[PDB]
Scaffold this active site. Sequence first.
Site, short mmCIF file in Angstrom:
data_model
loop_
_atom_site.label_atom_id
_atom_site.label_comp_id
_atom_site.label_asym_id
_atom_site.label_seq_id
_atom_site.Cartn_x
_atom_site.Cartn_y
_atom_site.Cartn_z
N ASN A 179 -5.48 -5.53 -0.92
CA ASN A 179 -5.06 -6.07 0.30
C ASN A 179 -5.22 -5.01 1.48
OD1 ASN A 179 -3.36 -7.03 2.73
ND2 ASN A 179 -2.56 -8.31 0.87
N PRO A 180 -6.35 -5.22 2.46
CA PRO A 180 -6.56 -4.38 3.45
C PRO A 180 -5.54 -4.37 4.44
CG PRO A 180 -7.65 -6.32 3.66
CD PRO A 180 -7.12 -6.36 2.26
N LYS A 204 -2.02 -4.68 3.89
CA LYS A 204 -1.10 -3.81 3.30
C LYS A 204 -1.31 -2.29 3.58
CE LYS A 204 0.54 -5.14 -0.90
NZ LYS A 204 0.61 -6.28 -2.07
N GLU A 208 -0.89 -7.75 -13.76
CA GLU A 208 0.30 -8.11 -13.17
C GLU A 208 0.94 -9.10 -13.94
OE1 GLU A 208 -1.95 -9.29 -9.26
OE2 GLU A 208 -0.36 -8.05 -8.48
N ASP A 262 4.07 -4.58 -4.52
CA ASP A 262 4.07 -6.12 -4.99
C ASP A 262 5.13 -6.68 -4.02
OD1 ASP A 262 2.82 -7.90 -6.57
OD2 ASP A 262 4.88 -8.43 -7.69
N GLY A 279 -1.84 -13.08 5.59
CA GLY A 279 -1.12 -13.81 4.92
C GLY A 279 -0.14 -14.98 5.57
N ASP A 337 2.11 -14.37 7.71
CA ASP A 337 2.52 -13.81 8.92
C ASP A 337 2.70 -14.92 10.16
OD1 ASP A 337 3.18 -11.20 8.12
OD2 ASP A 337 1.18 -10.33 8.75
N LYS A 359 5.57 -4.88 13.79
CA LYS A 359 6.00 -5.60 12.51
C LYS A 359 6.54 -4.46 11.49
CE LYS A 359 3.67 -7.92 8.53
NZ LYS A 359 2.36 -8.11 7.84
N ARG A 406 8.15 -4.63 4.23
CA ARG A 406 7.42 -3.47 3.72
C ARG A 406 7.72 -2.09 4.67
NH1 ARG A 406 3.09 -6.15 4.19
NH2 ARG A 406 3.53 -6.48 1.84
#
Lengths: 185, 185
Positions: free
Chosen positions: A9-10, A12, A36, A65, A141, A143, A163, A169
Site C-alpha cells: 500500500n503506497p 500507508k 494474512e 494491518d 481507500g 478516506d 491526517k 495510523r
Amino acid sequence: MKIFFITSNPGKVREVANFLGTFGIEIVQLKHEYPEIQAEKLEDVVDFGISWLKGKVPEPFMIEDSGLFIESLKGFPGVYSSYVYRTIGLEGILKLMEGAEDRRAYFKSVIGFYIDGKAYKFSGVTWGRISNEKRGTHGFGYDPIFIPEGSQKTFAEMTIEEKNALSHRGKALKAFFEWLKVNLK
Amino acid sequence: MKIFFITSNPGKVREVANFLGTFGIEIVQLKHEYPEIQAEKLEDVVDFGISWLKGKVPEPFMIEDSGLFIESLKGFPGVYSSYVYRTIGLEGILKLMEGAEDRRAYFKSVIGFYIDGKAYKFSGVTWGRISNEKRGTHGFGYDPIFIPEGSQKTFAEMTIEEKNALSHRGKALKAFFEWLKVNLK
Ligand SMILES: O=P(O)(O)OP(=O)(O)OP(=O)(O)OC[C@H]1O[C@@H](n2cnc3c(O)ncnc32)[C@H](O)[C@@H]1O
Ligand SMILES: O=P(O)(O)OP(=O)(O)OP(=O)(O)OC[C@H]1O[C@@H](n2cnc3c(O)ncnc32)[C@H](O)[C@@H]1O
Ligand code: NA
Ligand code: NA
Ligand code: NA
Ligand code: NA
Ligand code: NA
Ligand code: NA
C-alpha cells in the site's frame, strides 16, 4: 535508523515516511507477499505475519494491518476492509448505510515491528462517522467517507500532515516512535 | 470407513453425513479450531488448513471451505462468506442487490481430505441467482436467498436430499465419493 516497511500500500508508505521522516528515520518499502490469516483481531494478523516474515526479509522491518469497523454493520468490513474495498467499494458501504442515522465507526491500525529477534506491536484507534457521500481526493481507500470525531472534513479532505495528526495510523506511529526513543536510541 | 469432519458448521455435517451415510461411511464431527488464511481461492484456504491440522486430529479427516460469489458484487462475499453472514447478514446482501437485475451468482465448495500422509481436494460449483427476498426455512446461511440454476425454489425450500442433488457441496461430495471408490476400497 533504516526500517523496511513490508507493504503493497503506497498510501500507508507515504504516511509512515512523512511521520517518521521528520525524526530522521529512513523508510524503505519492500513488497514481499506474506500470509494474512483470517481473524477477529488485527493484532493476530500482525503476529502471524511477523512470524512468517522473519528470516525472509531484511531487518529491521515493520508491517501494518488496519481496517474500518462500522457500528451499524456490526464491525464490518473490519479485518477484511481491503477485500471489501476491492469488491463492493465505497458505493457498497454507502448503499448499506442508506438511511441509517447511527453512522458511528472507528479506524484501527496495528503496527508490527521486528528487531534483534523480537517482535513488538503498537496500535491506534480513531472513532468517527461515515459521511453521506464521498468527499475529497486526498489519501486512499475509505478516506472519502470517514470523518474523524471532532472534525468536519473527511480524511480525503486533509493533507497527509493533517491526517497523521488525527488518524489511527498516526496514533500507532506516535506510540511506535515513543517506544523507539526509549529503546532504540 | 470412518471420517472425522473438522468443522463448526452443523449444517455442513448433516449434508455430508446424509450423502456419504447412504454408502456406509461414518461421519464424526470434531470441532477443532484451525487457521484459515485470507486468500482468493478456497483451495488455498483448504491446503493451509490440512497442513496445520495434520498430527493434531485423528485420521482420516476432512475439512471444507465454501462461499457464495455474487457477480454484481465482483465475487463478494466469496471466501469471507461466513464473516459477511455474521455481520451484514442476508439483509445486507439484499440491500446491496437492491434494484439490480443481474443477480447471477455461484456457490463453490472445496473439500479437503487427508489420509495415509497425503492430502486430496475435491470441488463443486453451482451457479444460480440471488432471490428478491428470503424464502424457506430449511438449510443454513445464504440458503434462503439462493436459487440454483434450473430451479424455482431457493436452497432453503428444499429437503437435505434435494439440496445435495443440486448444490456445490453435493457435487464436491460426488467427486470425493468417486475418488474413494477407486482408491480407498
Ligand atoms: O496489507 P498491506 O500490504 O499493508 O496493504 P493493504 O492495502 O492490503 O492494507 P490492509 O490489508 O492492512 O487493510 C487494507 C484496507 O483498509 C482500509 N484503510 C486502512 N487504512 C486506511 C486509511 O488510513 N484511510 C482509508 N482507508 C484505510 C483500505 O480501504 C484498505 O482496503
Ligand atoms: O469453516 P467451517 O468450520 O467448516 O464452518 P463455516 O461456517 O466457517 O464455513 P466456511 O468458513 O467454509 O464459509 C461459511 C459461509 O459460507 C456460506 N455457505 C456455505 N455453504 C452454504 C450452503 O450450502 N448454503 C448456504 N450458505 C452456505 C454460509 O452462509 C457461511 O456463513
Ligand atoms: Na496488512
Ligand atoms: Na489485511
Ligand atoms: Na493486506
Ligand atoms: Na472452512
Ligand atoms: Na472459511
Ligand atoms: Na470457517
